[PDB]
Amino acid sequence: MAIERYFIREAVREMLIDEFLEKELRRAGYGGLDIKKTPLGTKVIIFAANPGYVIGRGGRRIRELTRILEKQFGLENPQIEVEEIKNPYLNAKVQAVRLAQALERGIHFRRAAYAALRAIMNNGARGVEIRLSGKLTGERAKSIRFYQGYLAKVGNPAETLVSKGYAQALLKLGVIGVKVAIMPPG
Amino acid sequence: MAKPSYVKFEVPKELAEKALQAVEIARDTGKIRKGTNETTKAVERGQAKLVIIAEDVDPEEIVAHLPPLCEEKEIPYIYVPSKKELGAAAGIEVAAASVAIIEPGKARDLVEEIAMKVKELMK
Amino acid sequence: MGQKWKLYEIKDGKVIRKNKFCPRCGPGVFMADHGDRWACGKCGYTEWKK
Amino acid sequence: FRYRGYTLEQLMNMSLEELARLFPARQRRSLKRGLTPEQKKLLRKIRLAKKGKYKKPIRTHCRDMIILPEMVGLTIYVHNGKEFVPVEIKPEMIGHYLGEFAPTRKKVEHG
Amino acid sequence: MQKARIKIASTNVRSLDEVANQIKQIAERTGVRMSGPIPLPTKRIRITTRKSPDGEGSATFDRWELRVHKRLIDIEADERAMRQIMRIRVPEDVTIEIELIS
Amino acid sequence: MAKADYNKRKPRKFGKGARRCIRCGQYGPIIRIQGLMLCRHCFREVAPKLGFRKYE
RNA sequence: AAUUGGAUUCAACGCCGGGAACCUCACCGGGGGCGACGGCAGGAUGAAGGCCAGGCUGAAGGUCUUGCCGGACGCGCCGAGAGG
Secondary structure: OOHHHHHHHHHHHHHHHHHHHHHHOOOOOEEEEEEEOOOOOOEEEEEEOOHHHHOOOOOHHHHHHHHHHHHHOOOOOOEEEEEEOOOOOOOHHHHHHHHHHHHHOOOOHHHHHHHHHHHHHHHHOOEEEEEEEEOOOOOOOOOEEEEEEOOOOOOHHHHOOOEEEEEEEEOOOOEEEEEEEEEOOO | OOOOOOOOOOOOHHHHHHHHHOOHHHHHHOOOEEOHHHHHHHHHHOOOOOEEEEOOOOOOOOOOOHHHHOOOOOOOEEEEOOHHHHHHHOOOOOOOOEEEOOOOOOOHHHHHHHHHHHHHHOO | OOOOOOOOEEOOOOEEOOOEEOOOOOOOOEEEEOOOEEEOOOOOOOEEOO | OOOOOOOOOOOOOOHHHHOOOOOOHHHHHHHHOOOOOHHHHHHHHHHHHHOOOOOOOOEEOOOOOEOOOOOOOOEEEEEOOOOEEEEEOOHHHOOOEHHHHOOOOOOOOOO | OEEEEEEEEEOOHHHHHHHHHHHHHHOOOOOOEEOOOEEEEEOOEEEEEEOOOOOOOOOOEEEEEEOOEEEEEEEEEOHHHHHHHOOOOOOOOOEEEEEEEO | OOOOOOOOOOOOOOOOOOOOOOOOOOOOOOOOOOOOOOOHHHHHHHHHHHOOEOOO
8 A cells, every 4th residue: 555554563563473373382481573574484483492303203393384484475385483482480471481381380379489480590690570460269359469579660651661471371270360471680 | 777576696705894995095195986876877978897786786776777777887885784874984084875986096916816706607 | 964865766777866856947857746846956946847 | 086096007017217207306316226135135025926926014214215107016024123013005105215104203292 | 767666664763764764775876866764644543442340340551553644755766776676674554555656 | 963154244334333343352442543542541551661651 | 122331429311422324233023054083873775065836025046846966974962162
C-alpha cells in the first residue's frame, strides 16, 4: 500500500512467528528471534539457551519449523539459523520460561524462587525481582514477591533498561503466573 | 462365481496365495476389475484371462449361471475361501468378492502358470 | 450403503444394459429412467426425455 | 380513485417497466435490482394456485416483497416469527410491503 | 547518465540519519554529482486507544505514535555507480526506493 | 441419513461479523483495520514488540 | 413467542458494544443435520457423496414415492473425543 502501512505489516509479521515459537521452543529455552526479511528467503534467527533441542531429535524440528513458515508467509524458502543467547541468565524471558517448567514440575515456591534468584545474581544482575501471582495452592488471590538489589525506576527509561520475562506455568489444580524482572548493570 | 458348497476341483493352499499375489501386481502395474456386478460382465464378453472367484456369494443372481458358462468360454476359474481374502489380494485393503484381471502387467510369468495348472485339472 | 443394485441383465454368453445412455454428454453415463425425466449420474443434471 | 392504479386488470398487462412510473422509490428498487432465490420458488406457488399442478397454500417468510397486481386474490401465509398469519390481498394493497400486513409483535395493551 | 532518486524512509530516528549521512559521504567522491539529503515530513501516525478492557469507571486512554520519516536524495550517476552506493548495511527497518529517469 | 456439506453458507458480505482477528478469533470484539486486525486488548499486549511508543 | 447476557452506591447506568437490517448473536419459531480413536458385530452381493420429477418445504434430494451414476469402506452403541 504505502510507507506507513508496510512497516506495520512487517511488525505484525514479527508477532505471529514470535508467538508460536516461544510456545514450542520451551524445551530449547526460548529467548528471541532476529528476523531478517528479504525477497529471497525469510531468514529467522531463533534464540535459545540450547541449540540441540531446536534442531530436534535428528533434523525433525528444524524441518518442522521450516515447514510451518511456508504456510504463514509468501516466502516459501525460509532459512533456519540457531544463534545462542550469550547470557541466558541476563535474559529474563529465558528465566521466566525456565522458572515455568520448574513450577510445572511441582518444586516448592521459595525454593524454586531462591535458586532462580541465585543463578542470575551470580551471572551479573545489579538487581532482580520475581513475582508469582496466582492461586498459591489455596483459593485466595495473593502474589509472593522475591526481592533483591535495585529495581525499575520511574517513567519509561525505567522499562527499556531492565529485562522482563513472563510465562504461564501451567498446573492441574489451577494456574500460577510467572513474572521475572531482571535489572542488568547499566 | 462360487458358493461355500461348490467343490468341483481342488485349490491347494500354495496355488491360492500365488493367485492372491498375481492379482496384487495386476492392479499396481496394469488394469483390474473388482465388484461382482462389473466382473459378471468381464468373464462373459471375453475380457478376463483367468477368473478368480470367492466362495461366499448368496443371494444367487450371478452364482447359478457362471460355473457352467465359464467352461464354455475356455477360461479357468480358481477359488479363494473368502471376500476379505480376495479383497486384500485385489490390490486394495477393502473387499472384492470377485475380480477380473484384464491384462497381466508384471504378474505375466505367474498368471500363465496358474491358468494351465487349473485348466489341466478341471476349469 | 444400499444393496441390491444388480440391474444389468444377463444373456447366455453376453451382457446387455437395462438403462439408457445419455444424449447430452457422450456414452459412459447411465440414466435414472423415470419414464419421462432423466437424472444424470456423473454429476447431477436436470434432463428431459429425447 | 377506487381500486389503486388505472384498473386492477391493466396493471397485470403492464408488469415490467410501466408500473415503475406509478410506484414509490422503494418498491421500484427491489423489482429493478431483482429479488433473491426464495422469491423464485414463490413464483411457482402463485402459478400452481391460479392454474394447473396441485396447488399448495402459499406460505412465505417474504416480508421485503411489495404487492403486485397479478398476486391480488390469493390468501398469503406470512410467518410472524412464531406462526403463519393470513392476509386476503386486495387491489388497495398495490404499493405497500407484504411484511406490513402480518404482525412483527403480538398485539396486546401495555401495563 | 540517469538522474536517480533515492527515497529513503525509516520508522526510527537513529536508523534513518546514519544511512542518509553515509549515502552522502561515499557518493561524494567518484563519478557522482549529488544534491543534499533533504528531510520531508514525519507522517506521524496517531492511533488513539481505549486502555481498559472493561471500558469501566474512568478508563485511561493510550496515545500512540508511529512516526515515519522520509529523507530524499537526487543523484547523477550510472546504474552501476548506484549499486556501489547501495552496498551499505542499512538498519532493519529502512525502506530505500529507487526511481530511474534520464 | 445423507446430506451435503456445511461450514456456514449465508451472506456475510460486510460489517463486524465479516471480520476476525489474527490473535483471539472474534467477530464483534475489536478489529483494528490498518493491516493489523486484532482486538484492542491484544493490541495493548502486542505493541512494544510492534515498536509503538506509549508516550504521548 | 423471544425483547440474549453480564454490570449495580462512590468504583453499574454514551458500561463490555472502537459500529445489532441478514451477518453479528449468545434469544425465539419453524425446517433440516455432522459424533473422532480404540472394542465389539457389519463390508464390493456397488457409496458412505451427488441427483431429475411430482408429493412435501417459507427455501434445502431436505424429506418420501421413484429410478440411478462416479469409484471405492463405515453405522449402532460402549470407553472416550472435537464443539459449546
